[PDB]
Write a structure and sequence with these properties.
homotetramer; G protein-coupled inwardly rectifying potassium channels; membrane protein; binds potassium ion; 16 strands; alpha+beta; 6 helices; binds ligand PIO; tetrameric; G protein-activated inward rectifier potassium channel 2; PIP2
């Protein structure tokens, strides 16, 4: 309510009264991988057992059409699967075959032509039942959405006059010595707005130019670096003074997107900054020290902000007051 | 005819008299995965059976060169595969070996040196026959082109003066609590045009600036958000009044591209808006309500449009009439 | 010599005296997949056989340390692998185990503790020998570089005054009803140039603005569409008249990049246009006809160019002669 | 210390006092693949053996609940797994089953219902233990981060007046006849800076416009080509004369990003240039010669730089001195 997207990156959105629920089953794969693990591990368990006893019913039924059960002690009646006698054995024959274990205490014989077809359609279909599930287990393990746990954001965002221009800043860092190839940063300001025609938008997304023009959005992320957005005329913080910033009802949403290095999958690290986390007159503490040929990044001071001197007027007043300085 | 691309996303295009049909077989993998499932499941079935009886013919023929069939009852003649007697058994030996089931009622012996080579070339080639097909079954299951079923578009597009500027708008929403990383929106206007030199183009694609300059095309898609294109001078709707919009022969094509979250594959969600679906003087109904800490998105009102007051002149007249207001 | 990159897309470049040949073996995977298939199929064959007889030597040597061969007829000496007697049988035991066939005519026994370790290190290492090779066979099959065989280019490029501005044009089409998601077009002019300081560059790449500014480079590729580059002042064809175009020594290189739809891999379709393939005063024939609700694309007329009336002056003269028209 | 990122591409950064070490285990897959191979091969070995003897304990314990050990010589007591007698045999039964070898000297029987469940939960869980590890071995083999070994950079960067404008240049080349699809080049200048407000940034990243505006950053990389950055007013080398360039404390970081051709993974090739590797008045030697229809690229002269005549003033003086030439 207070917050749109959590500081973890989770979003406070319930997707209400979706009516076309066939659309979830229209792409059964992607709605399967985004399940919980317990539900993934249960449906993985459920599909193999329902596969084996399905074929185990067919390995049972070919004994009844052939009458191998009707002459079980009669040894001249060579069965389709020898030593298959009961359903506990018939179901056991499928697991030995669909998993390609194949013990051969029960071994299919050649006198029966019917189950030879059943060796095909168990094995040619059991491979895709494997592949629909062994691939589903892989891409839930190798998903990029968990790489964001090692991409940390600053807990607060700060505002200070960086080189004459008032700038909004927040720190982002990577906790690994592996890289984020094609690392891009972008930022959306979301706030309720009301147009001149009465059309009130509840959570309107508005861009924040964190360097999309000059090429500064694509960033190099070995060390924690401060993402500075210059509060200029096009910025949505252009008329925000230090009087309004406790009273505003806005929310920054930052999205650090970039490909995982060891794969080609693209991670997305979301974080947010609400108007009680925006700090006026503060700046970040440095983290890089030089020691024995290497720059050491103390991550304990990653969030540490200290108060510096800063004017309290908005950037709209600060430019015009600078315009009176030349007179 | 009336429509270029369907509201589902399918395109009303037949690809006519393609002559270089070897180009389809020049990349046999990608022309295989885009088949129907019945044709994928049939060619998967067809290739394993034609593999096993191919090797089963070679497991047959090594009995004839060795004369194991010529001394089948003679027990001193240890065969290359013992208990291999007929082609129904020889074909059965391949399925037990190429699938690596290996029952061992028929078990290859060491007295024969010829079939030892045949164990290699069945297993070293049966693995890639597996891999050319078990991978083909995977990427047809894990394809991003089915993720677009959960990316819904508004059924209509609307036009209304959003904050003094006339703007064309359409809603897009995501039906899941999973995200679309790197979600981009772009829009093409396609219409027949005739140049000054008589060169008439049948379906000429023309861009619609939905925010490609400012960075507004890359969008954050947890909640349904309105994609607004400002009707400015560079826009192709610049001289379109409400008199012409029933009479036009144009068609919007919107493309929402973005990577699937759980994989790295990029989905493409197409939709279209023809000149009977463009609404003048209408605007969307809001969908986000706040309830118990979470924003709940009622998707029943996702398409709901209501009529608001709007001038009926074009944006070319609306700017110049505004230019007469300052006089 | 005449041509830099072929009309297929192959490049006429030999990579000379590369000295650091360890860099090829420093990434052994990617230098393996780009081999020919015969060399891929040979190294796949070579690695499994050298794996099995490697372990078959170890399955041999454990018989000598245990002396199972020294008491082969003596039945109280239960071997580590029973019925393992010779190297033809010992090598055969590895294929039955590393492929997980496991017939069980030769079956490992529990009296020996040494080969129990050998079951691990054969199976725990034979799985990655599989995975280093079954994955290598997959990504050579699923590579995007073969998707360019169904992306056709026009054989010629044309130049004609499209709507008052002289424009260079070439057609590109997709031969399938599957799409190219995120389809982008870009074009490089390569020609020898000599700077003012005598530094002569042999094949200097120079951009061609095919719509990179306005968003026209990202194209929608269901139907064959003409890629127009407007010959403006920044264009490298700005002072090229029809007198110079037979005499020039330039070469267009067009690159159509876009992701394959059924996967996430990005294809790259290269083609070229040399100064004998650039046509002045020509324009393309249309290909789209409307028939029974669908637009049918006759691909026979994909390359068909016809001569239209066009001024023969350059775009530098055509603007200035237009500048004299207003006088 | 002297250097931020090595000429190989490695970065001289230690990631200090990371406290939230659960974040590494929160995404156990990606922190596994970035390990060393010895640690990957050990954890792969450790997980299969701890899996098999885990189930081998359960295959042991079902003999004690059933009392198969209590009637081992008594043949009427058909065990759950026949010929399972000791823990050396019970552990051996798991490897024959979890790997799906299945010799059948020990073969599970149907009289026991308990171990039938144990066939499921060994096989339905041993497949994902395979898949969590056979996929981990694949993506460590198929990673794009090793493709950068065949992407070479020039060892030095040079500065010379290319066509009236002073330009900073460095060569990049690809050692293979395979391509880098979507090859982009970007460059960051990193140097310590001190703002007007005393906020001293230790290693501030600053862009270098290598052609991000005109579309020149996306480059075509069949032949070694010189990446030229024009020293203009927005460039950070704008006031750098030849007097300051030995005395500066800056460092170029170049990043050549592009997708691997045979896969869809994106490589990232980093290199660096420190102020002792920047050459004033030097230019590269050409490498392309034409021979027998093909351009041959002598890679021995890839790094070769020769001294040319160049003014020693900065680009700020060179423009203004040119401004005095028109007077
Ligand atoms: C209770 C019940 O019914 O479900 C149990 C639940 C199911 O799986 P489990 O919840 O652990 O799986 C994770 C969990 O669902 C998290 O909430 C997800 O996001 P996050 O963690 O919040 O970031 C995370 O994303 P993804 O991995 O699903 O994409 C999941 O992996 O947990 C287990 O069974 C242990 C996993 C074995
Ligand atoms: C009749 C006959 O000969 O073929 C039957 C046909 C084959 O499978 P089929 O292709 O219809 O199954 C999917 C279905 O057709 C979708 O409609 C396709 O996408 P779209 O909606 O067209 O865009 C989807 O394409 P893809 O995304 O899967 O490639 C299809 O796979 O349908 C079945 O048997 C159901 C699957 C078993
Ligand atoms: C003779 C000898 O020693 O090797 C023969 C060679 C090896 O396989 P090879 O790779 O050449 O097989 C394909 C064949 O060479 C095509 O002509 C190539 O087309 P392109 O021009 O690259 O488009 C294709 O490109 P790519 O797959 O290499 O990319 C090749 O893969 O061809 C075969 O044996 C057919 C495959 C079995
Ligand atoms: C000693 C000890 O405990 O570990 C031994 C170490 C483990 O493998 P190790 O990591 O050294 O093998 C690769 C090598 O170290 C490279 O130098 C690494 O990249 P870079 O050059 O550092 O950039 C590469 O990273 P990745 O790209 O493979 O992840 C490594 O995998 O080396 C071996 O055993 C050879 C492989 C068997
Ligand atoms: K067996
Ligand atoms: K087996
Ligand atoms: K097996």
């Amino acid at each position: 309510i207070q917050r749109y997207v959590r500081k973890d990156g989770k979003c406070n959105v319930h997707h209400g009264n979706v009516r076309e629920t066939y659309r979830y089953l229209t792409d059964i794969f992607t709605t399967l991988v985004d399940l919980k693990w317990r539900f993934n591990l249960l449906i993985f368990v459920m599909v193999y057992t329902v596969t084996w006893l399905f074929f185990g019913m067919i390995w049972w039924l070919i004994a009844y059409i052939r009458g191998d059960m009707d002459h079980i002690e009669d040894p001249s009646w060579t069965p389709c699967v020898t030593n298959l006698n009961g359903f506990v054995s018939a179901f056991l024959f499928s697991i030995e075959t669909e998993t390609t274990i194949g013990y051969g205490y029960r071994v299919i014989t050649d006198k029966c032509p019917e189950g030879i077809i059943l060796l095909l359609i168990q094995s040619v279909l059991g491979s895709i039942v494997n592949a629909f599930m062994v691939g589903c287990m892989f891409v839930k393990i190798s998903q990029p959405k968990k790489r964001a746990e090692t991409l940390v954001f600053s807990t607060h965002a700060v505002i200070s006059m960086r080189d004459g221009k008032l700038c909004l800043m927040f720190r982002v860092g990577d906790l690994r010595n592996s890289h984020i190839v094609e690392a891009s940063i972008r930022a959306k300001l979301i706030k309720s707005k009301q147009t001149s025609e009465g059309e009130f938008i509840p959570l309107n997304q508005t861009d924040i130019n964190v360097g999309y023009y000059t090429g500064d959005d694509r960033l190099f992320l070995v060390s924690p670096l401060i993402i500075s957005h210059e509060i200029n005329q096009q910025s949505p913080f252009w008329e925000i003074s230090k009087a309004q910033l406790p009273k505003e009802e806005l929310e920054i949403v930052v999205i650090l997107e970039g490909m995982v290095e060891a794969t080609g999958m693209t991670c997305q690290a979301r974080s947010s900054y609400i108007t009680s986390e925006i700090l006026w007159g503060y700046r970040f503490t440095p983290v890089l020290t030089l020691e024995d040929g290497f720059y050491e990044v103390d991550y304990n001071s990653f969030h540490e902000t200290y108060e510096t001197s800063t004017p309290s007027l908005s950037a709209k007043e600060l430019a015009e007051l600078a315009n009176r300085a030349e007179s």
